């Protein structure tokens, strides 16, 4: 007798970074209901995104193979004496995932370089799953300490291993790269050099002597750090 409707909010992700969104399934699921999450018109989820029941949470790390909107349904189902999930309600939202984050968590002037520090790592971001994705954002805190949400996770694209641009570098753990290569990378600054930028010791020492691999799960190839012109 009178269901309720329960609408949620459209959302917005970003090649490279971190997606959460808390999920009503109180509103949602009158007690003793089961609730699904998935791709509108799909059983499973878009390859980016994954749904944690307990929390509530709706989390994923987009590729540029992602570009584009996503429609989610949120739908609840009874289960009857049988076995059978007779559907009592679905709730849409789309995600609309944008192409570029621009190297700003979300910033420096106009025109003025972006100071990037990237870590390379031996690893195929298409070959993880988007919870792995995230830890290994999340994994990377310690070193960076920059939070989850403000981190970039990207491809290697071409097969470059390197910056030549980069002002500041230095090695990993890695002696072979097998994998097409990731990029793990934030923001230290605007317009910075090798005078202004942070101690970055904590990211050097523990690259090269593999305690940061050992951490995140990867091989590092290196570290650079570059001012990138800003878009």
């Known amino acids: 007798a009178v269901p309720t409707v329960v609408g949620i909010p459209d959302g917005t992700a970003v090649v490279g970074r971190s997606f959460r969104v808390s999920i009503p399934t109180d509103l949602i699921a009158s007690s ?10 799909k059983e499973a989820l878009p390859s980016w995104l994954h749904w944690n029941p307990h929390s509530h ?9 992602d570009k584009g909107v996503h429609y989610i349904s949120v739908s609840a189902a009874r289960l009857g004496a049988n ?35 990237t870590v390379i790592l031996d ?14 954002l ?37 002696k072979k790269v097998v994998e097409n290569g990731a990029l793990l990378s934030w923001k230290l600054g605007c ?5 202004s930028v942070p ?11 593999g305690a940061m691999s ?9 570290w650079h750090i570059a001012n990138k012109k800003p878009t």
């Open 32 to 41: 003793g209901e089961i609730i699904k999450v998935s791709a509108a018109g």
């Open 214 to 222: 050992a951490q995140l799960g990867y091989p590092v190839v290196g």
């Open 191 to 195: 317009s910075l050099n090798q005078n």
């Open 123 to 136: 690893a195929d971001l298409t070959k993880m799953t988007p919870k792995q994705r995230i830890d290994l």
């Open 83 to 117: 076995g059978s999930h007779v559907p009592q309600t679905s709730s849409v939202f789309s995600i609309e995932v944008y192409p570029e984050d621009h190297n700003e968590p979300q910033a420096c002037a106009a025109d003025e370089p972006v100071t990037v520090l």
């Open 57 to 65: 949470i709706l989390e994923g790390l987009p590729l540029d193979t």
């Open 138 to 174: 999340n994994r990377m805190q310690s070193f960076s300490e920059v939070e989850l949400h403000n981190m970039k996770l990207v491809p290697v694209v071409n097969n470059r291993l390197f910056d030549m641009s980069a002002f500041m570098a230095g090695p990993g753990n890695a």
């Open 199 to 209: 101690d970055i010791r904590g990211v050097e020492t523990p690259a090269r002597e």
